Design a protein around this nucleic acid. Structure first.
Lengths: 174, 164
DNA sequence: ACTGGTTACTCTTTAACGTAT
DNA sequence: ATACGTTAAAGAGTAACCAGT
């Protein structure tokens, strides 16, 4: 199939390895801040990095959040995962047109909190409207069309997830 | 042990189960913090879920009376053992009183000599015994929370690293 | 739908250990 | 000696699910 012919060419694969090599020459903290920002932008859990590369969860967490040091070879696996994952989510959205758990994005949480101030038990028509509003905002923060919301995958907002967020919030008001 | 003592234990569980659960939760959580008893110790001995217990102790998350009865039963029995342990598996836990002594000591010097570290061992062990209302002569009752010289060293080591 | 009770999952923190200057 | 490197353990926060209305 012509669409599956979008494997990696040798020249483009070498460019990936070159990026990883140039990343290892940069300051490790500055790259850690950029990888962490990417994980938050597309709500990619740190466990997916752990299960793929084999890095320790605490060492990865402390390296991304605090700047805890990490040897070159381990950082090379992190950067190799980063460059590979970027292309993977890139093709995931253009084709939209150990399963990870849904995570509420910060952009959607503001939309929900503002709806919570005006109604704590939203009807079905209010919940479904919030679904389209949240998935649009999540698509925007990723530099993606809202028409490609199917690419959100495990982080796609459903009507059921909106009800659970409101119900759990009412629980927190105690 | 004694029948009058065994009946007393069942009695206090009855009263505690007939009180506002949040009040007893703070009382149990304060006892855990006072003696630095890990919540994992409770989970292993009671069979309560780690998230449910932490949320019940911290936030007042609901918990059935049957589950609460297990937490209360563990609580009364632990107090008798802890008292016996001081009259005569768990990882070390720094107490809040000891940490203030170490903060001040760190403020003066960051790579303490084996002299100053052993002095701080005594100050922290005396400070931890005061927090639980025992005499400093019963510091061996601290068990897994007894302050040693290596533990003071790793505290200053890890804290120097946290400044970088 | 809803509250009440409940938890697997996820991640941060803690204390401790080993290794290379 | 001591900074650098590393992680098992511990616990808090999150999303979700069920039971009985």
């Amino acid at each position: 199939i012509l669409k599956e012919l979008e494997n990696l060419s040798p020249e483009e694969a070498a460019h990936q390895k070159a990026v990883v090599e140039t990343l290892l020459q940069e300051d490790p903290w500055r790259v850690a801040k950029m990888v962490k920002s990417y994980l938050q932008q597309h709500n990619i859990p740190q466990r997916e990095v752990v299960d793929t590369t084999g890095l320790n969860q605490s060492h990865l967490s402390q390296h991304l959040n605090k700047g805890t040091p990490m040897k070159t070879q381990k950082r090379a696996a992190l950067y190799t995962w980063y460059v590979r994952k970027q292309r993977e989510v890139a093709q995931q959205f253009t084709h939209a047109g150990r399963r990870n758990r849904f995570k509420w994005g910060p952009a959607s949480q503001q939309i929900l909190f503002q709806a919570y101030e005006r109604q704590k038990n939203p009807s079905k028509e209010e919940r479904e409207t919030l679904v389209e509003e949240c998935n649009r905002a999540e698509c925007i923060q990723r530099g993606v069309s809202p028409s490609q919301a199917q690419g959100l995958g495990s982080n796609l907002v459903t009507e059921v997830r909106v009800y659970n967020w409101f119900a759990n919030r009412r629980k927190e008001e105690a």
